[PDB]
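Q: Structure for this?
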Amino acid sequence: DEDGLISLIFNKKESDIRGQQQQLVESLHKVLGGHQTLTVNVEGVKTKADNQTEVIIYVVERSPNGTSRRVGASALFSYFEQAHIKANMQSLGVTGAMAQTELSPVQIKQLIQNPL
Amino acid sequence: DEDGLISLIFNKKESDIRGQQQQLVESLHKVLGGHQTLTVNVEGVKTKADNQTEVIIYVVERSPNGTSRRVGASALFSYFEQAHIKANMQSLGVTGAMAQTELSPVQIKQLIQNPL
Amino acid sequence: PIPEQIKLIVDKWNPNHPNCAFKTYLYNKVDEHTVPLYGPGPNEDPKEW
């Protein structure tokens, strides 16, 4: 979870993603609120189909004391799945998202008991 | 082991234990970390001598999916015997503890090979 | 006994689970130690589960 990796599927061709990567990364930064304490990093880009591309990201957050660390994957996924944020993501061409952390049974039970 | 029963000896009179049972149970809950996923239950209270009382407890743990079950007796005893936890227990008047599970020979051999 | 059958049929064709009559369970594989999670939700009879 500490590695903070979120996989995003885009309904865009790989060449289009790479061709405008600066813009894509900044738009993701804007979705996060645009503060200078958050930085979006691209871990990888992979074609999945003619017009489907997976983009793996993480977000580095800086503390008031200058320390930096990655936003945990579960925390970042939780933000992106919020209805308002998901809609903004869909406007960028995102059609899905996944975190790598395998949740514990108690975490899963909590999510089922409180799906919202 | 699934019944999760731990017997505790207190250096307190029975009337004192019963008279402040709410407080005693919450202090045990605090020793366990105080989370709302753990609940201390009193199975029985028995006088053993003028200023000695046995209190039998178990702990119910709730999973993220809303399921509940008792903490196994061996697991609970293992927690309470840890040096830091034992000291906290002694501050509540606990002078001894016992689990009912009869360990297997292989379990006993493991404990002797790794007493810590 | 007319407005009962009707309500029961309206109940059958519905996701509210008052004897939904379309009740089948499918087993989704999940590796340990995530078994303790899940954990049904709104209208799950522990009987069926």
